[PDB]
């Protein structure tokens, strides 16, 4: 019903997005950045979407360009899948507790592209989440949410109430956005 | 089912209110204060009420008296339309993002008349929203919410988390109250 | 018994005042400044005077001159109506609660022209109460009380204990002065 | 002439109130909370009312519910006994010195339900007045005055200027409210 | 009806006091301290007493002893003239504006001997009011009020809200006490 | 469907718990601590559970041990009644306004045992809620929530935004937890 397929070819990266809003959590994400894949899987699963992401980018330089472009394309796909935004709840928020972390996101679908991101500890501006592959810098979370809000043309407010672990803080923010989106896109029985 | 018609004649103003809780957003407000009309239209529409307001007051002096009396009558009408408050959710809250502003309202219908209003910037105590007609002073928002809570005999907590524009701050507060009321008045399937 | 009719013609404004101290609250005020009319009606009614005010002034410039001249003439009329001030209580004070505002005024009729005005919030020096007509600037309240005390040759002390709304603060100050005057002008049964 | 009988049955407590405004200090209070009985006796006696209070509540849990419900019913009874509030002074205040304590209360009967309570020392938020029976927590004084003002639909301002002993502070507040009410309900010879 | 004659002979001074509570302001005071005579005349006149004071003391040393003893005897006389304190208002307060000064006194006749004196500027602890005779030190005002309250066995609270001139501050305090006493000693028509 | 019966015998206390998640608010609690009974009744009723609690403990020493053990057993029962936690919403939050108090609780059922408790005033660490029986010390609220979260193996975040009365603060916290649990245990229609 509300589906979107977006292909975005640039110099930096080549992205393909497939999104269905009325899904069941069938998610398959591959971007070359493992932690970003983990986060997008959470975003897709907790929002009850159907999400397929195939991204190829210059991960030798760093993940910034791929992550940015993927977020832009995902935002575009979401905005297109919303369509006219007729007969939906249009307002959603969610608190996500993750151990010692509490995050909150509030969305307004009909509202104009705006993004406020507050509350993250100052040490998250130089934190890196690294494994066996391309690392993820937590200074990019604001960039990701801003890109998604700007390209979906929605109002997104993400707050971290408190939290210590950077993994938990990031994951909670993504889940909060996912659940706010899920609530906002539901049909309104009024 | 849950309807209320309130007529309030005083020296200062003459108010007529018609309210149905189980409505579809059919709103018609005329008070002689255009911005207050805008705000009441938002309140009625976002709460999914049926709201007709006809108010005549001494707008040559200022809008204070008309706005106060309208809020009192609207609160009375809401309280009467609730009736015994049997088999309703009784608890509602809503976050309303409006660009850079985030507002929150939480209600308790069965709770005794109480109103807490916090978070508004200090510059909103002397701000005026003015057009081609009778202006609206933002120092009256607290008065309006207090009057409505005191005459509906409900607990109303309105918070502004952050925000800059006075128009956005006011409009977000009214929408937050509307959506909290809407959630609180729904029948409880338990 | 204790009546006064004062006509004051100046370049700026033309004022006529009729005052009876032993009245019943028969008040008719017209100055071209609606909020000032409201305040003078409160002053006359809460002091149980008979008060007729007809004022014509240069309201195109601003209300300052008309308000100042009216206050001077009213003070003159009050002072003349007191006469010799023989066999009256001579001391009066009143607390006036108005919602969140608490004001207090204390008078000494036999005392020499003095006016102390304290307690008003700093934001009242640039606040405007505006409707559909000539606006009222709250920085003029001190001017009004000083003019009345200086021309009635009485001691007037007006205090605002606490308060937020400028309308309430102003109205409470006028009512406090009215009730203090009312108590002070009563005959002393001793 | 101005009498009221209020019976309020709830889950928590069962209250009966009998009040006459034009009384002579005939007071009989029994609530199961001895100190609250002492305070209500002072309230009734110093206001020159006729007051009969019979209250049964869950004092095994704590006195909060009984005290709250009694205050609500007393406020209702007072409001009903006032009636139309025609030809009364409508404004009353009283200073009550009690040893080292000075309290003040100011009322406005015609004014809308409002309660401001200021000045109490911070140590009164965790103070207990205890004897041989159910204790009295002084954090409930604000609750009591708010309940009475909210249910009588009057403006009540209670201030503690200074004071040390919690018994004296509480007793002075109750006496100040009683004397302010007494002055406010008198007929106005004007 | 309520009269008192007190003779107090000590080493330091010899005092005679004649007081009638139901008087008309017939005052004759002679203590050898002119300013103290002025203050006692104000106290007697503004309280509508009949007051005769004849005091002889060691004014060569200083006025302290004479002033103290006179205040003690006056307090004793007042306490005796009150008698059983049956059927009187028992509570009185008064604000006294005197130019730039505002003083307040509140009394409780039935209350136990207590005196609180607050608000006087710090420069009044070393100020002298001097003329052609024995000077008056303003550090004695607290002593005088304490002596009167302690010997009348009443509760006396005297506050100076604001003020600059020591003459005005002292005179306002005495007048405030006088008017509070006057109000408190009146019969209660209830 | 989702029921649990837990019997916990220790040296300190003997507890029996019966819990059904799909209930209608049929609550019967008896622990020997009246205020704790009140709080557990609120917890059971506002969560729409069926809750039977029979607790016998050493209330002669203090309520700590009984309250702690009851909370542990209740947490165990809840955790067992959840079972595999399959097909439930798994995330719930609730704002509870109670007069001047605003509390918030957010839960994550699948999340690992964690408890964050913030926002309570510092005076609640030495406050006692006492009636005619064993008193309740408010320093135990954190203990109770921690015990329940630790034994239910859920993530519980309880915040007090603002509040003055200790009774209201405690009651609001319990109701917030109840409503968050209620929302979290509902089946997910996705
Ligand atoms: Mn970038
Ligand atoms: Mn993870
Ligand atoms: Mn108002
Ligand atoms: Mn707008
Ligand atoms: Mn001027
Ligand atoms: Mn007005
Ligand atoms: Mn309560
Ligand atoms: Mn006592
Ligand atoms: Mn001495
Ligand atoms: Mn003098
Ligand atoms: Mn323990
Ligand atoms: Mn309770």
From Swiss-Prot, chains A, B, C, D, E, F:
Record has Transferase as a keyword: no
UniProt enzyme class: lyase
Annotated positions binding Mn(2+) 1: 38, 65, 167, 171
Needed co-factor(s): Mn(2+)
Compartments reported by the entry: Cytoplasm
Catalytic activity entry: D-erythro-1-(imidazol-4-yl)glycerol 3-phosphate = 3-(imidazol-4-yl)-2-oxopropyl phosphate + H2O
Cofactor annotation remark: Binds 2 manganese ions per subunit.
GO-annotated cellular components: cytoplasm
Pathway: Amino-acid biosynthesis; L-histidine biosynthesis; L-histidine from 5-phospho-alpha-D-ribose 1-diphosphate: step 6/9
EC number(s) stated in the UniProt entry for this protein: 4.2.1.19
Highest taxon above the source species: Bacteria
The protein's name: Imidazoleglycerol-phosphate dehydratase
Organism for this UniProt entry: Mycobacterium tuberculosis (strain ATCC 25618 / H37Rv)
Gene expressing this chain: hisB
């Amino acid at each position: 019903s509300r589906r979107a397929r977006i292909e975005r070819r640039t110099r930096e990266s080549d992205i393909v997005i497939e999104l269905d809003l009325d899904g069941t959590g069938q998610v398959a994400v591959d971007t070359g950045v493992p932690f970003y894949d983990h986060m997008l899987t959470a975003l897709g699963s907790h929002a009850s979407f159907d999400l397929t992401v195939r991204a190829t980018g210059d991960v030798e330089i760093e993940a910034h360009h791929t992550i940015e472009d993927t977020a832009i394309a995902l935002g575009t796909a979401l905005g297109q899948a919303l369509g006219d935004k007729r007969g939906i709840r249009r307002f959603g928020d969610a608190f996500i507790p993750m151990d010692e972390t509490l995050a909150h996101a509030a969305v307004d679908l009909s509202g104009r592209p705006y993004c406020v991101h507050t509350g993250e500890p100052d040490h998250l501006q130089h934190t890196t989440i690294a494994g066996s592959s391309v690392p993820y810098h937590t200074v990019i979370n604001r960039h990701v949410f801003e890109s998604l809000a700007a390209n979906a043309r929605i109002a997104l407010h993400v707050r971290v109430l408190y939290g210590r672990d950077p993994h938990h803080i990031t994951e909670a923010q993504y889940k909060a956005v996912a659940r706010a989106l899920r609530q906002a896109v539901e049909p309104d029985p009024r």
